[PDB]
Structure 1
Amino acid sequence: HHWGYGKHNGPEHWHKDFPIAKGERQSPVDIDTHTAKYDPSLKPLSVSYDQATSLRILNNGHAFNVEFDDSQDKAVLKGGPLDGTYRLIQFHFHWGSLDGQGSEHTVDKKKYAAELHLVHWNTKYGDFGKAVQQPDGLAVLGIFLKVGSAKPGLQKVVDVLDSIKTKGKSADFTNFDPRGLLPESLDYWTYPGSLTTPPLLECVTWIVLKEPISVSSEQVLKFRKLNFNGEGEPEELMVDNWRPAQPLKNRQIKASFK
């Protein structure tokens, strides 16, 4: 498959190879804050990242992934809408060419400058590959980024990007603390959806935090210097690697708050 974000291979084309792109539970969506309802059945959300063990950072030609050792019981997400325990495997971002766009989810149609996705798989299914054959296989914690003050906890990611400029490059990336990317509040919206890139599998419980984190203009500018292309190929800046909002269909978005 040769999908991407361009005019000739972008989101409007994905359905030809991945017909699930026009499915009943696709992501992202617009979160209409007035239609989302507080759900008192939601349990407290638990983000337990104290033993998170990052290993590596990879430019995969679509974004960059910070990968974790998920071989033991170590950085997990539980509670909220979730039954059981979901283990962190990687995080990545989606971002824009301009500060006015870049997020995948929108909030009352507002687009943020970027969106962080912390990807977790349901341990009852044993591995990520089996989890993505299940309707409750994955949980993704989504966090909006706005441009303002720098995020100190992001700077180690920013600083390593020079070593993974092009598709297929990786670098050791140990001892990174993903707690440094979390906002003060865990208030969230939740709904059932999908991966936002091919293969677009409908296996995700989305947990989208209401409070954005702030990053500096210089931090996001460094993201925009990455390349979609491989080394020695014509330069295509890695920008606008976001899928737009998809039809909500027969879903309800629930709020954890108020």
Structure 2
Amino acid sequence: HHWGYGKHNGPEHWHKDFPIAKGERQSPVDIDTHTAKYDPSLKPLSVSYDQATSLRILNNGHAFNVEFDDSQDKAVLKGGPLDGTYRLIQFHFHWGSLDGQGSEHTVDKKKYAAELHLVHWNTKYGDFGKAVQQPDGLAVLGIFLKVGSAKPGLQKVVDVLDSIKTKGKSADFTNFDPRGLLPESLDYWTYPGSLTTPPLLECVTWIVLKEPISVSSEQVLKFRKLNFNGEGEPEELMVDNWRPAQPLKNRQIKASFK
């Protein structure tokens, strides 16, 4: 009876195995755009993905992860609110059963069709497993997806999903360039939070881009053909793999822009 996104094991149940679910810096949150304060001391974000080495794509039963070689400073996130150098380890998405839901963060209570999480760890902690034990261990770059025009740099991801339909399937996924998933603007909101899945560790500096990317209805439909289940198990479509907004509590969301 493991955690997931069903009626019996979904987000309202997680606190029983992961009591930090009710903690003081849980993610995601609603971004109230009128209350977020411009912080003119925030620096521009530095996204340095030119030497990124993608390796593999994995259906983990909760989402799919595009994994990178993080054994050197190849694809890194710096600046913005961050002190030091954060290495890209993987990206994944959260999405809905319908275009009107799927994002984890909301903006003035608006839900987007999906949300991309580019996950990075602070190199001062040496490995990802050590970093998630620290309050400044991770930086997750969050990008909203809306349905409209296709995102050409997403199609190589969409086209491999048939090969990883079920939990535990992986596929080679070399030479994928995550720069093709970014919007034009790097304007962002930032706040201290958590992993949005168990173990819900309070180790993330969230950086949420204001500008969503557009994907096509056909691209997101292909996300919704994935399976939560393993091969030869009853089919349960991988949809609505998002945690809803959690209480902001004693936190301030800062804006990089006016």
Give the TM-score band, short-chain normalised: over 0.9
Q: Distance in 2 between matches of 1:132 and 1:170?
A: 24
* 1:169-215 CA distance string (max 9 Å, x none): 00000000000000000000000000000000000000000000000
Could you give the per-residue CA deviations for residues 39-89 of structure 1, whole angstroms, max 9, x where no partner exists? Answer: 011112100000000000000000000000000110000000000000000
- The corresponding residue for 1:149 is 149
Give the distance between the partners of 1:154 and 1:124, measured in 2 at CA.
31
What is aligned with 2:31?
Answer: 31
Q: In 2, Cα distance between the equivalents of 1:80 and 1:8?
A: 39
1:28-49 per-position Cα deviation (integer Å, ceiling 9, x unaligned): 0000000000001111210000
2:73 matched to 1:78? no
* CA distance in 2 between partners of 1:140 and 1:67 (Å): 14
Deviations 1:104-149 (A, max 9, x none): 0000000000000000000000000000110000000000000000
Distance 1:132 1:150 in 2: 34
Deviates more, 1:37-46 or 1:182-191: 37-46
CA distance in 2, matches of 1:172, 1:53: 12
Q: Distance in 2 between matches of 1:72 and 1:26?
A: 30
Distance 1:45 1:147 in 2: 26
For residue 120 of structure 1, give the secondary structure of its aligned residue in structure 2: strand
Question: For 1:44 and 1:33, how far apart are their aligned partners in 2?
Answer: 19
Distance 1:73 1:17 in 2: 35
Shift of 1:236: 0.1
Structure 2 unaligned residues grouped into runs of 5+: none
Moved >3 Å (runs of 4+): none
Query: What's the C-alpha RMSD, in Å, of the aligned pairs?
Result: 0.5
**Deviation digits for residues 224-257 of structure 1 (CA, Å, limit 9, x no counterpart):** 0000000000000000000000000000000000
Q: If the length of structure 2 is used for normalisation, what is the TM-score?
A: 1.00
Structure 1 residue 155, shift from structure 2 partner: 0.1
- Give, in whole Å, the separation in 1 of the partners of 2:13 and 2:220: 27
The answer as to 2:193 corresponding to 1:193 is yes
The share of aligned pairs that are identical, in percent, is 100
Q: Which residue of 1 aligns with 2:181?
A: 181
C-alpha separation between the residues in 2 aligned to 1:64 and 1:193?
A: 22
- Aligned equivalent of 2:130: 130
- 3-state SS of paired residue (1:142): strand
- Residues in 2 aligned to 1:43 and 1:209: alpha-carbon distance in whole angstroms: 14
SS at match of 1:155: helix
Structure-1 separation of matches of 2:73 and 2:35: 37
- Equivalent residue, structure 2, for 1:212: 212
TM-score by length of 1: 1.00
Between the aligned partners of 1:44 and 1:9, the Cα distance in structure 2 is 40
1:19 and 1:51 map into 2 onto residues whose CA distance is 39
